[PDB]
Design a binder for these strands. Structure first.
Lengths: 75, 102, 63, 37
RNA sequence: UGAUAUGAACCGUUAUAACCGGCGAUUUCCGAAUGGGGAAACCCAGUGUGUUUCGACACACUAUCAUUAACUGAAUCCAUAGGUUAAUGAGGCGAACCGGGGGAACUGAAACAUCUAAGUACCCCGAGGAAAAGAAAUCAACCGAGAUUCCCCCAGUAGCGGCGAGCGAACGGGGAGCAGCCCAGAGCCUGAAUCAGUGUGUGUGUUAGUGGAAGCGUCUGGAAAGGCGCGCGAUACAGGGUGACAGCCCCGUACACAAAAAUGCACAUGCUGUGAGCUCGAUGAGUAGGGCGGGAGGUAUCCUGUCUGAAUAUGGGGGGACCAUCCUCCAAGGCUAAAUACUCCUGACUGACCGAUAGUGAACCAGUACCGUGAGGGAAAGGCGAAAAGAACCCCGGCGAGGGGAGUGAAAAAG
RNA sequence: CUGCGAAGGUGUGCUGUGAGGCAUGCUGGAGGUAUCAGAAGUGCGAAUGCUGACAUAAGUAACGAUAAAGCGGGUGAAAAGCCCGCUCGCCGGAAGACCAAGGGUUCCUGUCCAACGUUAAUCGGGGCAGGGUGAGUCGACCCCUAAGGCGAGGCCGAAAGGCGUA
């Protein structure tokens, strides 16, 4: 099985910007860079495992994803 | 295999301050050493708005050539050359002229 | 530390390799990007550790 | 762009031996841009 | 913890820092690119197995040509061709020299174009690490010599050409080199020597190095390597960096020394394999001669399309032919050390060649900027100081540039 | 010989018929030179000789609606054309806007700006940097079908190909 290391490779880096900060503090969403393909299912699974958090939904040259967390958040 | 090291008592052989003793602070890869209290240079430090604002004139230490200093014998009160010898398989430094271990 | 994990079994050494990547590697990168990582030498240290663990897995597993 | 590549491109040069010699001469001279692309 | 390039965050201090050398793992996309295609760094692959998640994950193999093996097998009964699978090997790029297959102009002449330039420039294929050649159907007309190539004499000779410009020998002598075998096919006798491949041990050598003596002081000067007076050493005053021209402030040379692993050059030993003497045949069993066409031209010698058929140490061929006198010489399979040739890369050494419009195009972030569809040709630009602490504060001005003070430095006609 | 100051360069003086050399001041601050010889990439007024060096010509593109301009304020080295406030004149069943096709970083923020031998531009779409395209129920692609096109047999034709079913 190679789903594991695939999840370790879809995330690339987090995006930092005033819109990103505003989204995090208001809507509890974190925006981060992802792989070129980085389908929503893979992004959701990767965030679950690596950050051990719960995500409401993910909506997505480079690709960025606005990962939405539930009420409980860590980082 | 360097004669001058991090902590050594050395005496200047040549320059404007020949004869004054001192302790080496660090040695540069370019065959230069920094010894405090002899090679004072008045550097006009440009002010900066960063966390540090010393400005004014600073009294820094200017590096000198390794060959310009020698290890002080501390027993004969004069400069002396230093060589290497193997003892119990460990390389050590030793003076000349009644050579004794450091 | 280089020989400390040289006598570890594959399962446990695979686990610490997992932990090295999950914690202290992903978290550090977020802190550095966000700017709260005062000390950067951790990124160098963790990356070398991951490489050191990874080579042992290949050296042990298979050949 | 299309005509330029199809006339002096890498694949065009390698198709025939003389173009292959041209690439060899460029490599010997150590030109940064071996061909047009 | 590469440099440009300061600082901060880290690692190391009685033996896992960095750097150098050797042995491994790993090595994506693009380029001989092997699954296909196209406009080189762009998209798209198939099959089988495991994957805690039955929407997955990861990796190997698979092109064409030649050889070998296995399965199937025509047209046209068997054979054979084609197709499938597995293993091995061949393919591309980068100097010089040499070999094989082909092939020019300009420069030359008072116009018989051929002869010279020229078996050259350039282009194509393969091998070696030197290549080709390399143990006489050869020289000498009966003194002798005995493999090939290159250099130095004979020799700008003897010859050859509208005997015009040009091109250009052998034999003999003097050196280096001076070590040759097997197959046209066998009877008898064998762990019989040497040589090869695969290992160990000893000696030596290559790819990081250690130890390593020896000048103190004074005058001018901001600063001393030189001057004056006074020593030691010399197997070492070879060179460069080293505040002004340094043996003895240092880094080094000569002499004496080192090997975990890998590799190269001599011996011995263990295993496997190839292999000596005493004798008997043959002298390449469709290999000539003659006939026809072309080149080196009516024509000596060499190579071959097709159609026949005897020999060869017994016998067959050559420059002053004569019982094809005599002597010498054996003609259509490979291999053949070394002398002779060549320098794109490393280390050491050499220098009356060169010193920034020089030398290679580049002493340098120059195989660049720039010009062109592409190929190709191909710039300008070297030096502040021992240490860049590089400029606090204040004045004019625009919170610049530039200029005028102060401070640092021996010097600011070094900013 | 040599830091009480080398060579080169800039002046003066002496000597030889001519090429020059020796002795100095100033500038400059790091090595230089004679006699007896040898080795030649050694001396310059022109070869349309070669590269910079007194020179006669200055870096910012839209002159093609007979609906209408002017006054004020702010910024600027510049104001008949931009921004803000007060009016008039067109369109207003579109000279609005939202989709398909076509076009595919031009639309969103800070800037090369005291200007060569006297260059005097009314446009904040320019070259070089940073951001936005967020989806179960917007739509397409995924499933089935006609025409057109293609496609192992059969039907038409001595083969193949075409027509044609799955």
């Amino acid at each position: 099985m190679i789903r594991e290391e695939r999840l370790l490779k879809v995330l690339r880096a987090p995006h930092v910007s005033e819109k990103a900060s505003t989204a995090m503090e208001k809507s509890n969403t974190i925006v981060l860079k992802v792989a070129k393909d980085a389908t929503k299912a893979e992004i959701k699974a990767a965030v679950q495992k690596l950050f051990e958090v719960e995500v409401e939904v993910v909506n997505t040259d480079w690709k960025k994803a606005y990962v939405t967390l539930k009420e409980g958040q860590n980082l | 295999a360097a004669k001058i090291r991090r902590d050594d008592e050395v005496i200047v052989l040549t320059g404007k301050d020949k004869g004054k003793r001192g302790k080496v602070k660090n040695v540069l890869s370019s065959g230069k050493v920094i010894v405090e209290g002899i090679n004072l240079v008045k550097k006009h430090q440009k002010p900066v708005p960063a966390l540090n604002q010393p400005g004014g004139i600073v009294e820094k230490e200017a590096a000198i050539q390794v060959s310009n200093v020698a290890i002080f014998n501390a027993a004969t009160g004069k400069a002396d050359r230093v060589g290497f010898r193997f003892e119990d398989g460990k390389k050590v430094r030793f003076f000349k002229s009644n050579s004794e271990t450091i | 530390m280089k020989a400390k994990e040289l006598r570890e079994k594959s399962v446990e050494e695979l686990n610490t390799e997992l932990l090295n990547l999950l914690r202290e590697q992903f978290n550090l990168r977020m802190q550095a990007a966000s700017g709260q990582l005062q000390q950067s030498h951790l990124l160098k240290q963790v990356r070398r550790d991951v490489a050191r663990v990874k080579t042992l897995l290949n050296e042990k597993a298979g050949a | 762009v299309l005509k330029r590549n199809r006339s002096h491109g890498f694949r065009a040069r390698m198709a025939t031996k003389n173009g292959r010699q041209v690439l060899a001469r460029r490599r010997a001279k150590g030109r940064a841009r071996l061909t047009v692309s």
